[PDB]
Amino acid sequence: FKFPDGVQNWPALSIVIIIIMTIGGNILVIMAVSMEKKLHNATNYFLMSLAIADMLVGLLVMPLSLLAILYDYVWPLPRYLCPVWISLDVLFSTASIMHLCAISLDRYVAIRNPIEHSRFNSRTKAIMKIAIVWAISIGVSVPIPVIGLRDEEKVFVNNTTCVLNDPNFVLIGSFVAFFIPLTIMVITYCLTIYVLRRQAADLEDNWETLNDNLKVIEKAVKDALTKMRAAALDAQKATMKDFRHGFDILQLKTTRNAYIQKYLQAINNERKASKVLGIVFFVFLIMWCPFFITNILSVLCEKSCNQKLMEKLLNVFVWIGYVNSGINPLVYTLFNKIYRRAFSNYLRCNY
Ligand SMILES: Cc1nc2sccn2c(=O)c1CCN1CCC(=C(c2ccc(F)cc2)c2ccc(F)cc2)CC1
Numbered sequence: 001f002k003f004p005d006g007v008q009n010w011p012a013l014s015i016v017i018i019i020i021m022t023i024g025g026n027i028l029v030i031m032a033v034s035m036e037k038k039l040h041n042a043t044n045y046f047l048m049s050l051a052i053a054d055m056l057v058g059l060l061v062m063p064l065s066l067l068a069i070l071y072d073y074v075w076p077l078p079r080y081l082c083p084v085w086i087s088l089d090v091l092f093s094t095a096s097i098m099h100l101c102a103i104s105l106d107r108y109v110a111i112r113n114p115i116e117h118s119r120f121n122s123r124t125k126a127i128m129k130i131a132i133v134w135a136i137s138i139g140v141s142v143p144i145p146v147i148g149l150r151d152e153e154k155v156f157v158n159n160t161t162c163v164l165n166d167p168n169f170v171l172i173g174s175f176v177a178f179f180i181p182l183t184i185m186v187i188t189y190c191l192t193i194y195v196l197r198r199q200a201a202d203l204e205d206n207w208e209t210l211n212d213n214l215k216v217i218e219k220a221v222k223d224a225l226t227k228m229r230a231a232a233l234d235a236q237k238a239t240m241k242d243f244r245h246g247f248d249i250l251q252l253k254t255t256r257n258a259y260i261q262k263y264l265q266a267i268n269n270e271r272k273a274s275k276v277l278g279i280v281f282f283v284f285l286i287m288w289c290p291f292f293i294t295n296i297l298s299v300l301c302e303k304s305c306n307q308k309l310m311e312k313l314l315n316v317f318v319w320i321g322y323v324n325s326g327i328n329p330l331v332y333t334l335f336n337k338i339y340r341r342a343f344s345n346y347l348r349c350n351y
Helices: 011-035 042-070 081-109 122-141 143-150 167-216 222-235 241-248 252-299 307-335 337-350
Strands: none
Touching: 011 042, 011 307, 011 337, 042 081, 042 122, 042 307, 081 122, 081 143, 081 167, 081 252, 081 307, 122 143, 122 167, 143 167, 167 222, 167 252, 222 241, 241 252, 252 307, 307 337
16 A cells, blocks of 8 residues: 555546545535434435445545556555455445435335325434345445455456456346346336426416416406416315415415415425436436446457457546546535535535
């Protein structure tokens, strides 16, 4: 570990900046979800446990990858330390996709069959769901120290570079640890975003007409006045008892701000959450695709392919996937005033 004698790529040390921003960024997420009241809920507990995995990627996987780059991918640490790092790489990377898939799956199940959650509270129900995503993650990574130490060629190429080299494990494992959870996250997300739009459009299309027909009354009628009573007529047929009669009493603009905005902001809130999750989901998908494509493209042709080129591309493609462990705290800041406000305060009033 930085002898320093023997190092062959000193400008690679500049990747430390990537490492520092991946740890500190997710630390702030851990601080925010731990301290902010308006962030204490199942979805944001998922993000904290996710930030714990992404912080441990930058804390335990990124530094030992950088060290290998510094020695031209000739493993500089003891040989037993290679399969330990490979399993820590697999564990925390799987925990990332397993968190995103669990968020999208729980959000989908929360919408289809929203039965009265009478068994446990939301805080404690989240704890079990976080336990299964870590239980699976440990389950995928725990064979690797066995396979690697029992047979060192499964984790060493050319007896020098430390990389996972078991084709059966890499193939089957890529399905269990990446392809299946990614397939679930995409379908559940889109299916969720389809249900949410159909149910919101029920009230929205009635609330949109009443609003538009109010503009013509300020243009500036007996057809536009009855245009607004028919709007609320269909709105009050779907939404608790204070809502049905709430429209039946509706100068008009004051009633809209009095009680309609209670649900109007509620639906917009659900829309803003689907926006953030989709960006987090599909940026994760996009930043891991080049590595996974190039990898699964490297075994579809055993020969007839430039294997030397594949490895060189994968050296860069793995860090495109790694940088994703730092991207999530940035995304929260851009799209949520609670994270952005807490982040600026932790950077100032604490640091
Ligand atoms: C550090 C490094 N450097 C170089 S240079 C040239 C190659 N190369 C490498 O292969 C690696 C290891 C990359 N490492 C990324 C994390 C891994 C996942 C995984 C788990 C188990 C598998 F079976 C299949 C892949 C994963 C990826 C995304 C996820 F969302 C979840 C898991 C394991 C592979």
